[PDB]
Amino acid sequence: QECTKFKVSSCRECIESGPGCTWCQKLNFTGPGDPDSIRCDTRPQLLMRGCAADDIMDPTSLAETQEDQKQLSPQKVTLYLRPGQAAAFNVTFRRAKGYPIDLYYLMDLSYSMLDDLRNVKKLGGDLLRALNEITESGRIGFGSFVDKTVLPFVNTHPDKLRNPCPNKEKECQPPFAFRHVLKLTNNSNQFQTEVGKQLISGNLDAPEGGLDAMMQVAACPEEIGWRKVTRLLVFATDDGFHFAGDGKLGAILTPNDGRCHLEDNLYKRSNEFDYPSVGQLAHKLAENNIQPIFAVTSRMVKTYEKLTEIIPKSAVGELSEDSSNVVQLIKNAYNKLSSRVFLDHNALPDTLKVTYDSFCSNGVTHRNQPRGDCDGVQINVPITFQVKVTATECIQEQSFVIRALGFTDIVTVQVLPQCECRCRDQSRDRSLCHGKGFLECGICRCDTGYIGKNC
Amino acid sequence: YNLDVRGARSFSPPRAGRHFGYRVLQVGNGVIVGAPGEGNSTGSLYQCQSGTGHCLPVTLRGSNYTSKYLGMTLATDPTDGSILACDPGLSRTCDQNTYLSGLCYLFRQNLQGPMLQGRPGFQECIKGNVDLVFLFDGSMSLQPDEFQKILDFMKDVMKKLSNTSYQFAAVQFSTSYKTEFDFSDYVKWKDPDALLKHVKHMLLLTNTFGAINYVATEVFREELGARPDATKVLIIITDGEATDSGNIDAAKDIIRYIIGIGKHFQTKESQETLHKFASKPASEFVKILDTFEKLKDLFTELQKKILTSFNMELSSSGISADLSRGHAVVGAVGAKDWAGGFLDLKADLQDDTFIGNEPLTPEVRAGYLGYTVTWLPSRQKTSLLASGAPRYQHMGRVLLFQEPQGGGHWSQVQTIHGTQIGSYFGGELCGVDVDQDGETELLLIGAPLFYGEQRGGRVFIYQRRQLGFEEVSELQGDPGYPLGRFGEAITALTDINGDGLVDVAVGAPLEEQGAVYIFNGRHGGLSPQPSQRIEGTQVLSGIQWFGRSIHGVKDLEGDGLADVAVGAESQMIVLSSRP
Ligand SMILES: *[C@@H]1O[C@H](CO)[C@@H](O)[C@H](O)[C@H]1NC(C)=O
Ligand SMILES: *[C@@H]1O[C@H](CO)[C@@H](O)[C@H](O)[C@H]1NC(C)=O
Ligand SMILES: *[C@@H]1O[C@H](CO)[C@@H](O)[C@H](O)[C@H]1NC(C)=O
Ligand SMILES: [Ca+2]
Numbered sequence A: 001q002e003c004t005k006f007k008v009s010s011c012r013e014c015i016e017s018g019p020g021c022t023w024c025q026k027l028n029f030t031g032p033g034d035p036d037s038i039r040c041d042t043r044p045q046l047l048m049r050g051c052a053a054d055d056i057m058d059p060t061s062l063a064e065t066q067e068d069q070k071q072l073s074p075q076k077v078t079l080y081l082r083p084g085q086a087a088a089f090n091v092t093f094r095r096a097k098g099y100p101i102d103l104y105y106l107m108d109l110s111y112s113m114l115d116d117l118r119n120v121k122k123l124g125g126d127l128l129r130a131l132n133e134i135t136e137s138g139r140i141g142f143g144s145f146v147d148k149t150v151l152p153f154v155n156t157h158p159d160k161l162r163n164p165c166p167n168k169e170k171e172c173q174p175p176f177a178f179r180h181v182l183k184l185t186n187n188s189n190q191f192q193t194e195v196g197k198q199l200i201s202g203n204l205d206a207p208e209g210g211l212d213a214m215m216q217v218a219a220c221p222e223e224i225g226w227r228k229v230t231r232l233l234v235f236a237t238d239d240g241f242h243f244a245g246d247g248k249l250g251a252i253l254t255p256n257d258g259r260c261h262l263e264d265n266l267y268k269r270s271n272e273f274d275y276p277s278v279g280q281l282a283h284k285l286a287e288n289n290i291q292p293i294f295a296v297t298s299r300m301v302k303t304y305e306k307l308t309e310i311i312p313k314s315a316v317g318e319l320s321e322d323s324s325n326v327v328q329l330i331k332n333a334y335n336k337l338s339s340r341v342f343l344d345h346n347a348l349p350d351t352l353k354v355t356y357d358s359f360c361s362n363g364v365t366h367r368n369q370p371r372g373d374c375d376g377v378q379i380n381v382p383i384t385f386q387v388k389v390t391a392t393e394c395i396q397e398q399s400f401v402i403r404a405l406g407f408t409d410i411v412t413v414q415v416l417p418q419c420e421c422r423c424r425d426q427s428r429d430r431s432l433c434h435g436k437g438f439l440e441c442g443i444c445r446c447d448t449g450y451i452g453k454n455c
Numbered sequence B: 001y002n003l004d005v006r007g008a009r010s011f012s013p014p015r016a017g018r019h020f021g022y023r024v025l026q027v028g029n030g031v032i033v034g035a036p037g038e039g040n041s042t043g044s045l046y047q048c049q050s051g052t053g054h055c056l057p058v059t060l061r062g063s064n065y066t067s068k069y070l071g072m073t074l075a076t077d078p079t080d081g082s083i084l085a086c087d088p089g090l091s092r093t094c095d096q097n098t099y100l101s102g103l104c105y106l107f108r109q110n111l112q113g114p115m116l117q118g119r120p121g122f123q124e125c126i127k128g129n130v131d132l133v134f135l136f137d138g139s140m141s142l143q144p145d146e147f148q149k150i151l152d153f154m155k156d157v158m159k160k161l162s163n164t165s166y167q168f169a170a171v172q173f174s175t176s177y178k179t180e181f182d183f184s185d186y187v188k189w190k191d192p193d194a195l196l197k198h199v200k201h202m203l204l205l206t207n208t209f210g211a212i213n214y215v216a217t218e219v220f221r222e223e224l225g226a227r228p229d230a231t232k233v234l235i236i237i238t239d240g241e242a243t244d245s246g247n248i249d250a251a252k253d254i255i256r257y258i259i260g261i262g263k264h265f266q267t268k269e270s271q272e273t274l275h276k277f278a279s280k281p282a283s284e285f286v287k288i289l290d291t292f293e294k295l296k297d298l299f300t301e302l303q304k305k306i307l308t309s310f311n312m313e314l315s316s317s318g319i320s321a322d323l324s325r326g327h328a329v330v331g332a333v334g335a336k337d338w339a340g341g342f343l344d345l346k347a348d349l350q351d352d353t354f355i356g357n358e359p360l361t362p363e364v365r366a367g368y369l370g371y372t373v374t375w376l377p378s379r380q381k382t383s384l385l386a387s388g389a390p391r392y393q394h395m396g397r398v399l400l401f402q403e404p405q406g407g408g409h410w411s412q413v414q415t416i417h418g419t420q421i422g423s424y425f426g427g428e429l430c431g432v433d434v435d436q437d438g439e440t441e442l443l444l445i446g447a448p449l450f451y452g453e454q455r456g457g458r459v460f461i462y463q464r465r466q467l468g469f470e471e472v473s474e475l476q477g478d479p480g481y482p483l484g485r486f487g488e489a490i491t492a493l494t495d496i497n498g499d500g501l502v503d504v505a506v507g508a509p510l511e512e513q514g515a516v517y518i519f520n521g522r523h524g525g526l527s528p529q530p531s532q533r534i535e536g537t538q539v540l541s542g543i544q545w546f547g548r549s550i551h552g553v554k555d556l557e558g559d560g561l562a563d564v565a566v567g568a569e570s571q572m573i574v575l576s577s578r579p
């Protein structure tokens, strides 16, 4: 409703000047004493000056979509953004048949997990059975963690580096940060034989270094052996976790670098890098599409539930003191993850603002939110997200993507400015401006040469 | 807004490790740089001079010991220029256990001058086998009923410690000394009543020096039943000051408790005369009892106080420190199973007072209280101490403590809880006195790992109201670095733009190559928006972690312009405020 002018000299310079500015494309619209600045003003002011509605140039934002197997549609959208004016389009999510599942079992091997280890060693077949009950063609893997091997996270006395467990126990291995035990496989006997070799361990302080191991799992996809399917990372523990900052107690001041450091399937350089931050891990997990399942004991449940705020595609289930219920935990967690659908976008320049409206099938609706969010999403029951994109400037050609978190399918959004009036054909008006200059938008932009105004 | 980036100067020794620049401090006579060692390397403190442009490592004259931690903890007192530096890496083993605490250094003049040192929150090693000697007063001053209660005390201590690895001996001292029973005598019977049956009150003087020496040379003997692999412990019971003089160097290897009883230890001047006989610190090894009847109360301290649970063995003292108006405090994050706390330090560094959470609950454990400790001083209102527990409940919180008032004690006056797991709320603190009126009215709390809304890290401004600190605002850094760690370093900068109001710098070392934000002081608080953002890229092409440390209280060369030192990876940088 408002048009501050500065030095408009053509139609594009008019539209760029403000969201409420419009341009009149009529011939001989200007009086001699008046400049061509007067062709730019608000719509009512231009109508007051006699411009017909069909000669008022007012570009408006626009969304065009190319659709082309129905989980995320459309796949390509083109946006023409008039500054200050939002363009809207709906993304339809149709939850498809579940993909195969790669489950990497990342287990805490502190001493209180001794009875847990005796059970997990015999659950290779139960885990693959469960994966092939949810979908088909499942694979399982295994890793273990304790903590960084420096004071005060472990006791560095040589007797206790040899036996971190209580002195009576002697099927105990030295402390270690992360060990990759089993590459993802459908062979339950490899699980039984390789996990069977693992001995219980120990450490000094209550929090542990499982976030280190999770970072290595996410940073080493070739060693872990992920397929391009559903990637579940079970994190089984009975304790809290260290994170960035805690390394200072052991004089570790270098941040986690987010790189793969597996040598001989061991995080050997773990005493060189501090623990990751939670956000850093949430970022690494979303990059590689790895969805963590925090299988923690009762007293840790509420602590690990707060992680689901930072890691959108994660879930928490209460693990037994001997881990004997872990299979139902995984089943419940898969339903928790798959019934929740987030629609989000990658990083944007400060010139674009994206908001989401969620039209969920479970009767819930959210409008104008920073992220699409629906719960209770059921197979083959479509939900809709209305995406609104607004630009503050006349932007340069640009693109970003929109994902349903937890899947690799994207909506590629091509973003173009709309600072150009698409004006009338100069046909029927040829003989032009009594000169060689050509017309654009009812205002003569004369070929250079003498120039001026009427030409 | 007037910091001259185009004139920034770089300081870096040719063998600087990556953690040179972990701490920077402008002191009277230059800039100090803490450089913790990486890997196997030990740490060090560097002296950097603006006129020279070079950084030279400092040699400590009385330090038997230097770990990789040295350089991690640096504080200076604005009132007198003192320097506090701590080495929280004093590692040691006790049987199969390993202990870890700190070693702190106090420089009254500068790093080159006289130095005091101490070991705050240091728990001595006491093995499974303990040979303990009772050295009890039998002087002319004791009534028969008082002498008996000293003897009853020794019997009750042996009664409680029967069926342990403890072996006992006892020596009466007055003018002379007599072993009432040896370690082998205790092995033969294990009967306190029978071992002390023949004791007769000497009723003479009080020669404590000679007595302690007699214990070290005549009592701790293998042929008398002493075990060479046991910890030697000495419990001294006296009702008056020593009537001799000298030294107890012969007994230095012995862990020494002393118990001062009764009217002759009424003045604290006489109580301090017992410190030279006991181990350190006096707050642990010197017990002052106003009456002999309180000896029965003592069995809790001198029996229960003499691993799945940890008290101060892994205190990690010196991991943080502050120094203001001659008063030093060091954090102790490992205290009480990493519940944490801090250590009120006597200013010769030979005694300390621990303060932690109360009550000790399961929830405060693994909270790392004392990860930051920051004095919030005032001249009219009460002076406070803010300490962060950035791991409390995996979220972090800040406790506010009030200095002892009058005769009373340290008091906890407020708790401020963080809301996001992993945010390390309370991992960085800073008090600000904007108008420089002597009242610290602002506490800034950094949450450098805070996640969300496309910017990493937060700094919250709290202002002191009548009932406590109220959250007034936030220091707003740029979006675009979700992991940038805005708030890893926060410091008050004095006045850099000449309007009389203190300004604040916030470092964001992981915003690309690092950055520092300047927030100017205004009337009523701090501006939430920054007036300047210095990109590390612009200072050095290949720099990293720019803004990991900041200190700008000083004008290093006396040209009328404020100076701000900034730490980075292997670098220290000086920026000058220019009109
Ligand atoms: C989907 O977007 C269309 C415009 O293309 C709009 O009419 C409709 O309201 C949106 N969906 C819902 C459920 O409102
Ligand atoms: C198990 O999966 C592997 C994929 O690596 C495949 O080669 C093999 O044929 C499968 N075996 C069975 C019995 O399905
Ligand atoms: C270092 O050892 C010497 C013994 O020669 C002693 O004088 C000094 O106090 C010791 N320093 C510390 C900090 O214990
Ligand atoms: Ca268990």
Ligand SMILES: [Ca+2]
Residues within 6 Å of the ligand: A146, A147, A153, A154, A203, A204, A205, A206, A207, A208, A209
């Ligand atoms: Ca641990």
Ligand SMILES: [Ca+2]
Residues within 6 Å of the ligand: B433, B434, B435, B436, B437, B438, B439, B440, B441
């Ligand atoms: Ca003030």
Ligand SMILES: [Ca+2]
Residues within 6 Å of the ligand: B494, B495, B496, B497, B498, B499, B500, B501, B502, B503, B520, B521
């Ligand atoms: Ca100022």
Ligand SMILES: [Ca+2]
Residues within 6 Å of the ligand: B555, B556, B557, B558, B559, B560, B561, B562, B563, B576
């Ligand atoms: Ca200067």
Ligand SMILES: [Mg+2]
Residues within 6 Å of the ligand: B137, B139, B140, B141, B142, B206, B239, B240
């Ligand atoms: Mg006496």
